[PDB]
């Protein structure tokens, strides 16, 4: 497969960073990593519906073919880092695991 | 004349970015002149510049937006009142004037992300 996302992005003054992660059949699952390397948030969504991410999570995504707009919230200075956007292609088979090189989110700068 | 500075930097919410530009010093009392540049798409222009002895405060007569101090191999620069559009590759050039010999060294520029006012 092949996941690619924005080269670089800069969160707003309130802590809202939103990039566009796109992959190359209907129930996809984007897992947001972070470079150690740990899990920020994740979800499973149909072809073109709103993502979920539990409910107490810090992400909010929408999607529509090839890509999905993610939006991490409540970010701060220390958060800044390479946020890798992984994309798995679940049911229906065949599987497919594509990983991006991550978009660098620069937030080191609170109010 | 290798000049190297911070990989990338992000100005605070007020527009205060501050990097460390360090060069290979001279083995004899000497006058250095640091000039801070900046590239847009490619239009390269002068932000500010100062001439300072070995280890004293930079006197930016320019009255510009620069306030730096120095002490062997490196000078701490501090550009002020930045905004969203400023954000760019601020190249930090270092010239080693009198006494001879000369020496022109340039950095690959520290990337100052500011695109984010209050």
């Amino acid at each position: 497969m092949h996941v690619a996302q924005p080269a670089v992005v800069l969160a707003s003054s309130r802590g809202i960073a939103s990039f566009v992660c796109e992959y190359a059949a209907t129930e996809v699952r984007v897992t947001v990593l972070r470079q150690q390397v740990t899990e920020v948030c994740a979800a499973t969504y149909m072809m073109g519906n709103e993502l979920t991410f539990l409910d107490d999570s810090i992400c909010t995504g929408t999607s529509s073919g090839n890509q999905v707009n993610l939006t991490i919230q409540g970010l701060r200075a220390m958060d800044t880092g390479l946020y890798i956007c992984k994309v798995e292609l679940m049911y229906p088979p065949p599987y497919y695991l594509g990983i991006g090189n991550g978009t660098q989110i620069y937030v080191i700068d609170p109010e | 004349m290798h000049v190297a500075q911070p990989a990338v930097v992000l100005a605070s919410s007020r527009g205060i970015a501050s990097f460390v530009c360090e060069y290979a010093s001279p083995g004899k009392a000497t006058e250095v002149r640091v000039t801070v540049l900046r590239q847009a798409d490619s239009q390269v222009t002068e932000v500010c510049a100062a001439t300072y002895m070995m280890g004293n405060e930079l006197t930016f007569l320019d009255d510009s937006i620069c306030t730096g101090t120095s002490s062997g191999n490196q000078v701490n620069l501090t550009i002020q009142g930045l905004r969203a559009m400023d954000t760019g590759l601020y190249i930090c050039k270092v010239e080693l004037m009198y006494p001879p010999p000369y020496y022109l060294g340039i950095g690959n520029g520290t990337q100052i992300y500011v695109i984010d006012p209050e």
Partner: protein, 109 residues
């Protein structure tokens, strides 16, 4: 895992899975695919859907819910390849993969 079968005979592609959190094929989805991301058999939430089964595998496989394996019948001279078993756990939160094992298939002519 490498397993040999003879031409026109059958082959047993194990999944190697070993249910830990004891689950039924209902709250799970199981399929197998080859070196080309094609599909052999699929066991959806308990049933067996062929909606996305490749022609070459259709009508020549069978699930053995017992050993979580999968017999592939009437072997050809093309089946000689690498197959992988996968198992997702369709929770409410969404399907998550929970297992994936590979196997090599040598068809002795």
């Amino acid at each position: 895992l490498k397993i040999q079968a003879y031409f026109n005979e059958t082959a047993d592609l194990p999944c190697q899975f070993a249910n830990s959190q004891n689950q039924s094929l209902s709250e799970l989805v199981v399929f197998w695919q080859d070196q080309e991301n094609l599909v052999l058999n699929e066991v959806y939430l308990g049933k067996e859907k062929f909606d996305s089964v490749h022609s070459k595998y259709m009508g020549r496989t069978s699930f053995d819910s017992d050993s979580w394996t999968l017999r592939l019948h009437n072997l050809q001279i093309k089946d000689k390849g690498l197959y992988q078993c996968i198992i997702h756990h369709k929770k409410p939160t969404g399907m998550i993969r929970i297992h994936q094992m590979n196997s090599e298939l040598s068809v002795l002519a």
